[PDB]
């Protein structure tokens, strides 16, 4: 499939002489697999999936050393950002980073990513060509000028085309999977001769899913209520969708669940 790796990094400054807090989280196919947190007892990268436990202490020490590098680069960046935006130093700011690659079923790089945000807002981002930067901001032009002059884009391009891709592959071989949704519909009263029908999908992995309601073969995109997909806490997910229908006409409505673990999409109705 469209395999992916991401590293999501955050440094948050704190008032009163404290060093910023730095957290890095690695994701393979949207699932967390490593994590580093500078607030920990003995700060180091730790495995967050079982299939990472096969890696030797060299791997951890190497990743842990990179994190100490990032921590510092983030810390100096925060200081600079404060100066760029003319802000005072009593306060609390954030710098976030997103890095990673998308691979095809052929194991070939589809797209590489390198993005930063300051205080939750787009700051600078490497474009899809991997040579140019889009700065969202007056202050980010300062940064863009520096990185164009130094050829920083080249460095990030090499990481995204090489190391990111090779390691994603290694991690996939290390990790060789779906859980199909169990679906049902519930029935809920309303006033004025109307009823709510709710289509539930439960216990599914991965998180991606589509739920539709049909009236006589026509999709009800318009007045369908939909919750955001939510974690169950056991590694699986939950979602539901609902429509308000006329009382006594419930059998005319069909729910369909689309999920990649399913042989066929599920098709179901209210079953009293």
């Amino acid at each position: 499939g469209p395999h992916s790796m991401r590293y999501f990094e955050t440094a948050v400054s704190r008032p009163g002489l404290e060093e910023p807090r730095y957290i890095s989280v690695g994701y393979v196919d949207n699932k967390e697999f490593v994590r580093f947190d500078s607030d920990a007892e003995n700060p180091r990268y730790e495995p967050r999936a079982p299939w990472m436990e096969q890696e030797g202490p060299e791997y951890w020490e190497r990743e842990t050393q990179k994190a100490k590098g990032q921590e510092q680069w983030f810390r100096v960046s925060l200081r600079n950002l404060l100066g760029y935006y003319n802000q005072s130093a009593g306060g609390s700011h954030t710098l976030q980073q997103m890095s990673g690659c998308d691979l095809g079923s052929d194991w070939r790089l589809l797209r590489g990513y390198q993005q930063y945000a300051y205080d939750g807002r787009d700051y600078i981002a490497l474009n899809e060509d991997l040579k140019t930067w889009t700065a969202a901001d007056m202050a980010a032009q300062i940064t863009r000028r520096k990185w164009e002059q130094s050829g920083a884009a080249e460095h990030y391009k090499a990481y995204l085309e090489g190391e990111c891709v090779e390691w994603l592959h290694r991690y996939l071989k290390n990790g060789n999977r779906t859980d199909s949704p169990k679906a049902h519909v519930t029935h809920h009263p309303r006033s004025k001769g109307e009823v709510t029908l709710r289509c539930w999908a439960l216990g599914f992995y991965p998180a991606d899913i589509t739920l539709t309601w049909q009236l006589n073969g026509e999709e009800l995109t318009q007045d369908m209520e939909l919750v955001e997909t939510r974690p169950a806490g056991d590694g699986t997910f939950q979602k539901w969708a609902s429509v308000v229908v006329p009382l006594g006409k419930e059998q005319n409505y069909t729910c369909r669940v689309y999920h990649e673990g399913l042989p066929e999409p599920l098709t179901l109705r209210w079953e009293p």
């Binding site: 590293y7 100096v76 960046s77 600078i124 990185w147 190391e163 990111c164």
Partner: peptide, 10 residues
Amino acid sequence: SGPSNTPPEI
């Protein structure tokens, strides 16, 4: 395997 940011910083 994670990124190792190059200087210059931001």
